[PDB]
Amino acid sequence: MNPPPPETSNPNKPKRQTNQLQYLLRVVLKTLWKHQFAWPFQQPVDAVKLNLPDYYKIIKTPMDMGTIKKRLENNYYWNAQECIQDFNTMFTNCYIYNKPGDDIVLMAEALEKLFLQKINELPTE
Ligand SMILES: O=C(O)c1cc(/N=N/c2ccc(S(=O)(=O)Nc3ccccn3)cc2)ccc1O
């Protein structure tokens, strides 16, 4: 059985808009979402649909780009680092659950390399 997805909104959290958060949504998330390998990462891992009955026994901090998109859009993140950490969690979850050399690991590695290229150009101020 799948867990509920990660929280994406909280009416009590303070909100702010920074140039880095705007770039994370309008550039970073947008670019990764369109990538040829993005589709397995566009929504929470559905262990029932995918027949992965051990997924949530191994992965205790699930994360995905659909969740990250919602967090950015809802102003859930206060610090750009929170969003960067969620992307890192997504990539590392793939490396944890799978094994070196698996196709899905190669795909995650390619998305991670593109992610690092884009966050290298995070704006200042
Ligand atoms: O949930 C998903 O959508 C999901 C998708 C997965 N896709 N695996 C794939 C998807 C595509 C390919 S591929 O046809 O493009 N071949 C490839 C791709 C990269 C490197 C080497 N070979 C190879 C494996 C693997 C696990 C998953 O859970």
UniProtKB/Swiss-Prot annotation:
Please state the span of the N-terminal signal peptide per the UniProt entry: none
User: Start and end of every Bromo domain?
Assistant: 16-122
Q: Share the record's PTM remark.
A: Phosphorylation by CK2 disrupt the intramolecular binding between the bromo domain 2 and the NPS region and promotes binding between the NPS and the BID regions, leading to activate the protein and promote binding to acetylated histones. In absence of phosphorylation, BRD4 does not localize to p53/TP53 target gene promoters, phosphorylation promoting recruitment to p53/TP53 target promoters.
Question: Where does this protein reside within or beyond the cell?
Answer: Nucleus; Chromosome
Tissue specificity here reads: Ubiquitously expressed.
Cross-link type Glycyl lysine isopeptide (Lys-Gly) (interchain with G-Cter in SUMO2), residue numbers: K57
Coiled-coil stretches are none
Site annotation Acetylated histone binding: residues: N98
How does it associate, per the subunit comment?
Interacts with p53/TP53; the interaction is direct. Interacts (via CTD region) with CDK9 and CCNT1, acting as an associated component of P-TEFb complex. Interacts with RELA (when acetylated at 'Lys-310'). Interacts (via NET domain) with NSD3, CHD4, BICRA and ATAD5. The interaction with BICRA bridges BRD4 to the GBAF complex. Interacts (via NET domain) with JMJD6 (via JmjC and N-terminal domains); the interaction is stronger in presence of ssRNA and recruits JMJD6 on distal enhancers. Interacts with NSD3. Interacts with NIPBL. (Microbial infection) Interacts with bovine papillomavirus type 1 regulatory protein E2. This interactions may serve for the tethering of viral genomes to host mitotic chromosomes allowing successful partitioning of the viral genome during cell division.
Anything noted about its domains?
The NET domain mediates interaction with a number of chromatin proteins involved in transcription regulation (NSD3, JMJD6, CHD4, GLTSCR1 and ATAD5).
Q: Its function? A: Chromatin reader protein that recognizes and binds acetylated histones and plays a key role in transmission of epigenetic memory across cell divisions and transcription regulation. Remains associated with acetylated chromatin throughout the entire cell cycle and provides epigenetic memory for postmitotic G1 gene transcription by preserving acetylated chromatin status and maintaining high-order chromatin structure. During interphase, plays a key role in regulating the transcription of signal-inducible genes by associating with the P-TEFb complex and recruiting it to promoters.
Query: Any additional notes?
Result: JQ1, a thieno-triazolo-1,4-diazepine derivative, and I-BET, a benzodiazepine derivative, have been tested on tumors with success. Treatment with GSK1210151A (I-BET151, a I-BET derivative) has strong effets on mixed lineage leukemia and promotes myeloid differentiation and leukemia stem-cell depletion.
**Illness the protein is tied to:** Cornelia de Lange syndrome 6: A form of Cornelia de Lange syndrome, a clinically heterogeneous developmental disorder associated with malformations affecting multiple systems. It is characterized by facial dysmorphisms, abnormal hands and feet, growth delay, cognitive retardation, hirsutism, gastroesophageal dysfunction and cardiac, ophthalmologic and genitourinary anomalies. CDLS6 inheritance is autosomal dominant.
Protein family membership: Belongs to the BET family.
In its UniProt entry, what is this protein called?
A: Bromodomain-containing protein 4
Q: Which organism is it from?
A: Homo sapiens (Human)
Entire protein: which part is shown? 43 to 167 of 1362
